[PDB]
Please model this.
Amino acid sequence: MLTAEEKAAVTGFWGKVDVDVVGAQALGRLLVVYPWTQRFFQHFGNLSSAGAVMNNPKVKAHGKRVLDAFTQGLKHLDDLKGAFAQLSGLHCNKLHVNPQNFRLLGNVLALVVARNFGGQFTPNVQALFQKVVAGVANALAHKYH
Amino acid sequence: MLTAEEKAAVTGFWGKVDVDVVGAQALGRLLVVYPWTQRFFQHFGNLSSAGAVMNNPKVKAHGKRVLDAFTQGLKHLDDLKGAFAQLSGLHCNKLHVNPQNFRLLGNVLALVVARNFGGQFTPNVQALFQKVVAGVANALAHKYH
Amino acid sequence: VLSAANKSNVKAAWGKVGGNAPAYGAQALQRMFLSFPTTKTYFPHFDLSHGSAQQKAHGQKVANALTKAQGHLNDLPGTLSNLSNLHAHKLRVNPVNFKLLSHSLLVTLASHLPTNFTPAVHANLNKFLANDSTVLTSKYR
Amino acid sequence: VLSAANKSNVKAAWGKVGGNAPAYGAQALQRMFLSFPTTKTYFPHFDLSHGSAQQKAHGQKVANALTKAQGHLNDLPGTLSNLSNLHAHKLRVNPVNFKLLSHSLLVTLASHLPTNFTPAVHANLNKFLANDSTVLTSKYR
Ligand code: HEM
Ligand code: HEM
Ligand code: HEM
Ligand code: HEM
Model:
């Protein structure tokens, strides 16, 4: 949503982004860094260790899809809260996460990519990615019912 | 999600409620509790003791028209974003306010409503009011950056 | 972190609160399920809600911890470690949640002693609960 | 909890960093300028360049205190005592702006030391900045 000159930039840089372990990691760390989120997943087994939680095939799979899922956001990034509608559904449904943990989680992916990416996750790509989770943190809970 | 109505069928509850005394109440309680509030209200003077930070003619006025502001708003909920886009121009362009604050003066508000009116203030009267806040300075973050 | 006109505060407010302090967590705890739902989750044993006996039984207990908590304002960690990690390491009460009781009980407060509850007592009473508040989160930070 | 291994990745962390810390302050801000724009109002003055000696001598400073702070996890409240109050307090520097500045250095941090930078390096830091911010906010508190 931004310059199309900005959309331009995350569209290109999303894509060099490896989905499988950019959400394993992002799911991964979210895991032992918010230790309380760890609630929503009795869902897999072993988060009572950093080694464990990460690797844990399950919290692995989780991020895979907890991630190009987001990142299928954009295409449209755009219309809507549309998109995401949906998984709102699910999120105030029978989990019931804060709109608060949407925004960590969004903030865990920017530590990810910053350090996978590394000198390119730039205060301007850093910048725009920011928006993006501001956006995707946000539809998911505007969503509430 | 206004329910209809408890919402507005429950603000009914609304006026009767009062101006100068709620706003000046709500704007004065907020200005002595998150002191960082103030940086912003400069315009303004004493704010040198809980004391005349209460006096404040400045503050006192402004408690009014704020309350006046919204409140009114209590008026069509339908399309809140509408109503004060006008004024997320202002929080956002003018002084650049954190969302964060938006909830801070509504939950002051929830409190100063709950002082005012009492028993009159239910579990029921507080959570209906507990969500105008929520759309109102969430309406407020729509837009801004 | 409290200022010492603060501990002050917290105290004829809390010492006005009285023997009312057990109806006081009933009322807050019953104020947030209502007002900020998504916290109801922390409580599947009880029927919750409304005048409920699990809920006057637990506001007791929220209520107690706090008469305790100031009480001895020179030192809440050592009074809460016991507490506040089971909410911090065995329940895994996300911290957000802190600040709704906070309001729940300050708005619970504010309703019973408002000739009483002063721009200068909500202040002190607000600080007091970020702080009961910070040390229940510990476990981490 | 300032907790020992916390303290022992915190300083190990800290430690890979060196004379880069300078570097990171100002990449930090470089940084919260452009990515949590509302902070930028604090920096009236301030030629926020782009990359600008203003930010630079600043960026200098937010890491020299960083750096101390890394090197005496016990006595922060007596340590920050000048700066708790510049910020708190005289600066009056919204708390919701600390959590800001702190994510952007774990970026920063995390951008430059990805070998060494673990969920555990990652958590002990998070937390440390966590332990930063709650000291220099005491006004409040
Ligand atoms: C930051 C706080 C978060 C939390 C604590 C939360 C927790 C949850 C849980 C507790 C479930 C149910 C898993 C199941 O049946 O296994 C889930 C499914 C999920 N979440 Fe989240 N979520 C979070 C944010 C996110 C965001 C931030 C996205 C981004 C688009 C998202 C994407 C999804 C996906 C696609 C599904 C279900 C996958 C499936 O249909 O098979 N999540 N997540
Ligand atoms: C919680 C945080 C808030 C803060 C720190 C903040 C700060 C300020 C500032 C500083 C000004 C006017 C400064 C100028 O005119 O030079 C201002 C005006 C305004 N504020 Fe706020 N504001 C707060 C929230 C609110 C909320 C929540 C509402 C809606 C009620 C609002 C309603 C207004 C109204 C109504 C005007 C006047 C401008 C008109 O319609 O002409 N503000 N505010
Ligand atoms: C100031 C705030 C809190 C204090 C002072 C308070 C104090 C306590 C007290 C004392 C207990 C009794 C533990 C026992 O001594 O044997 C308890 C248990 C419980 N606490 Fe709170 N608490 C606070 C807020 C919270 C919040 C925001 C949550 C989560 C939403 C929460 C969730 C829990 C629940 C879930 C238990 C479990 C009950 C049971 O399964 O038999 N508390 N708390
Ligand atoms: C890690 C958190 C932080 C440290 C360790 C840190 C360090 C400082 C330092 C070492 C100085 C000036 C002391 C000097 O010349 O003695 C300072 C001043 C200030 N701090 Fe921070 N700071 C923090 C966070 C923040 C944040 C989040 C903002 C803003 C949004 C903020 C705004 C400022 C400004 C605006 C000044 C002022 C220089 C003048 O105007 O004379 N600080 N801080």
Notes: The CA atoms of residues 39 and 114 of chain A lie 27 Å apart. The pocket of protoporphyrin IX containing FE (ligand 4) is lined by residues D 39, 42-43, 61-62, 65-66, 83, 86-87, 91, 93, 97-98, 100-101, 132 (CB under 6 Å).
